[PDB]
Amino acid sequence: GMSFEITEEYYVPPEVLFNAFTDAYTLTRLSRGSLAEVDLKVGGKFSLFSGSILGEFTEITKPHKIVEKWKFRDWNECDYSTVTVEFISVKENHTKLKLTHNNIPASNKYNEGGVLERCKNGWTQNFLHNIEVILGYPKK
């Protein structure tokens, strides 16, 4: 309803996956060219797809964990979801990626629903997909 969890393993070490979530130039490649902007610090803002997705870093524990406030700009001004991303070392050059997306609103500011699938398709179909296919990180 308001949360989902995605779990994936990559044959690459945690720091490289951590980079991919926090580095403007990697984020832009994962966005197929739309400018990602990143101020990488606690309280630092971020923006993907020219401000279509915005957020703020709230915890940066390199290279194991990040936590974010995170919204599409079309959500209510007040509404912010929480994204937590863990990069867990299974063994050498093998990382377990666990993404948790909580506190997803039932609808945007124009009372349109289907917000949860939109967040989930965003991760599976674009972002997490391109880590494999664009960045060339092999996945189970």
The three state secondary structure string of the chain is CCCEEEEEEECCCHHHHHHHHHCHHHHHHHCCCCCCEECCCCCCEEEECCCCEEEEEEEEECCCEEEEEEEECCCCCCCCEEEEEEEEEEECCEEEEEEEEECCCCCCCCCCCCHHHHHHHHHHHHHHHHHHHCCCCCEC
Side chain identity at residue 106, one-letter code? A
Question: Residue 66: exposed, middle, or buried by beta-carbon count in 10 A (0-12, 13-18, 19+)?
Answer: buried
Question: Residue 70: exposed, middle, or buried by beta-carbon count in 10 A (0-12, 13-18, 19+)?
Answer: buried
Experimental technique behind these coordinates: X-ray
> What is the residue range of 91's domain?
1-140
Domain count, the chain: 1
Residue 101 belongs to domain with CATH number: 3.30.530.20
Task: Quickly tell me which residue has 């979801």 as its tokens.
Answer: 81
Question: Residue 35: exposed, middle, or buried by beta-carbon count in 10 A (0-12, 13-18, 19+)?
Answer: middle
Resolution in Å, one decimal place: 2.5
- For residue 9, the cross-strand partners are 96
For the chain, give the longest Cα–Cα distance. 47
Q: Residue 115: which of 87, 84, 73 has the closest Cα? A: 73
